[PDB]
Amino acid sequence: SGFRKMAFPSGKVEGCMVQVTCGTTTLNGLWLDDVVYCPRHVICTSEDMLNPNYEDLLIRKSNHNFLVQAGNVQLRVIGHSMQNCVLKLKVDTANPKTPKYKFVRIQPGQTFSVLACYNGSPSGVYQCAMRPNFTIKGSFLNGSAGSVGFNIDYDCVSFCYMHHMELPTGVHAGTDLEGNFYGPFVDRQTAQAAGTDTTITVNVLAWLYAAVINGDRWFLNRFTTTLNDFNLVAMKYNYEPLTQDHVDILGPLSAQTGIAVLDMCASLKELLQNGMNGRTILGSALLEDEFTPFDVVRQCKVATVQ
Amino acid sequence: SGFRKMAFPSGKVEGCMVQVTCGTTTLNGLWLDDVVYCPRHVICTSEDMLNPNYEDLLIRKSNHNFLVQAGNVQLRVIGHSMQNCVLKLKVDTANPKTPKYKFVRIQPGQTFSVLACYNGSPSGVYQCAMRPNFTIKGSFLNGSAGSVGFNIDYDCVSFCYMHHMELPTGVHAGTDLEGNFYGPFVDRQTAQAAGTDTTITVNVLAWLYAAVINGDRWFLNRFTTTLNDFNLVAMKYNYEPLTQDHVDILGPLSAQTGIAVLDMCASLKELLQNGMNGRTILGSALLEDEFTPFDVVRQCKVATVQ
């Protein structure tokens, strides 16, 4: 029993992290086979960030302008190119610790693990969710760009996020591993802002099921509702509408607890309207939305099969 | 910016995890050089756990009775001994992935990263604190015993916890890597009560500093108090006494923010006596106590030196 914010083990990703230096600018790269992937603003000085002309800046860089280090090992750059907002640096050495991997592009609501790195050195691991507004609520300082987000299944690393930038609300934006930003964000100088975020309803429901599985059930009532009725409540409180697909995905949690999904929706409606009144759920005094149904099933080993 | 529950990168520990099976009982072991460390209850079945003569039970076990698998590949046991509540199984193969390591005893209030494992396979990583009542609020199911807790300092892994058991309140107990339990617990099947837990005051202060560093300053009003007056309030709210030693270790956070420790104590006193006014701090609607001062300094790279 118990329930914690849990990341995937990070070892398979640690062996892929390198430092990339161009002049005086440094960030992290991801070394898979004989390519290092990193954010393209490594080619910018502080002066360039007034208005970076990335294509013009890159044309004056040779292979020798890129210093790539895996720990103390120097990886010689033998080619370079730009793909959307990432650079691909071809190196002379293939990474012997390259795991089985895929590059994937995820949807809002999905969670992933982040290996935060500085100067090519892994510092820590934590869990993030892709927010409905395509930001993430990470923990990133200057020098962390190029840190990646990932999930692991059957020893295959699915890389879904490369970190690029921080917005003045304290939230983070980045790309897939082909260099395409999530959301409307750009790595230019435009005075941009994130859209209004909402709460990930299906994840809150998953977390309420985790709470019941772990014995916290004071919030259960006898009532039920419908998708139509519940979604009027969701709109009022800035929650994402619940879809029937979400209801179906919650199936294994409903199956193991015996609590119908629309019954759990009626419990959530009451929590939204009246709050918790000095009580907690899984150690929290607010409704948590960064655990997916998959996250709960995996961490609590939810199964009716024996 | 940002502030997350952050674990150390787990790769160095992943390569040490193995499965130990004795009869129908399976749990995890820690493989360092030519020794596997695991909880001694692997030698027990339902038949002999109320009053297990572990010395007698171990005598009935030969080296062949211990099946050790590293990545589903068998390691041959060539010796076995018991040290307090752990077994040391000598194997004929030294682990080529053994990191630099130390076995350490942590103090109450200190944090560590847990690599949760089942059948020798790492499942996830999360952060825990050693509670004042010497339990931990983990996430552990049957088969997770032998999972370990650790911190990393300069490529040295300091192992501080090996998981053994769950108390009926849903919290967890275990040993150091010398096999001595934290707190008044035994691996015997006696009914065991944890002491009433208390809140880790110095950690709440550290987390309030983390909030300030991240821009969350609504609870600062330039008030200050004395150490004795603060400790009178702490006592009323089930908070641990704050010692001058605790004040000292908050130094780096006070240094970067310019907020004296006793000013932050006055802020915390106000939050305790009057509540959080419905507000959230760093994504929490309650006061969080599982970040140490060092955790904040590490994650936020706190320093006045440039």
Numbering used by the authors:
A (entry chain B), B (entry chain A): 1 to 306
Task: List sentences from the manuscript.
SARS-CoV-2 Mpro is a functional homodimer of two symmetrically disposed protomers that are each 306 residues in length (33.8 kDa). The active site of Mpro features a Cys145-His41 catalytic dyad, which orchestrates nucleophilic attack at the carbonyl carbon of the invariant P1 glutamine and the formation of an acyl enzyme intermediate central to efficient peptide cleavage. Using C-terminally substituted Mpro chimeras, we have determined X-ray crystallographic structures of Mpro in complex with 10 of its 11 viral cleavage sites, bound at full occupancy intermolecularly in trans, within the active site of either the native enzyme and/or a catalytic mutant (C145A).
C6 (form 2), C10, C14, and C13WT have also crystallized in space group P21 but with a distinct unit cell, two molecules in the ASU, and a unique conformation of the donor substrate (we term here form 2 - see also below). Interestingly, the others diverge from this canonical binding, we term here form 2: in C6 (form 2), C10, and C14 (crystallized isomorphously in space group P21 with two molecules in the ASU) the substrate sequence is kinked ~ 90° at the P3 residues and tracks instead between the dynamic Met49 and Gln189 regions. This altered substrate trajectory appears to be coincident with the close contact of the donor C-terminal domain in this crystal packing. P2 valine, unique to cleavage site C6, also maintains a highly analogous set of interactions with a markedly similar S2 pocket, but with a less optimal vdW interaction surface as a result of the gap from the static pocket edge to the shorter beta-branched side chain of the P2(Val) C6 variant. No major altered side chain amide rotamers are observed in our collective 52 structural visualizations of P1 over the varying substrate products or acyl enzyme intermediates, remarkably even amongst those with markedly varying main chain conformations such as C6 (form 2).
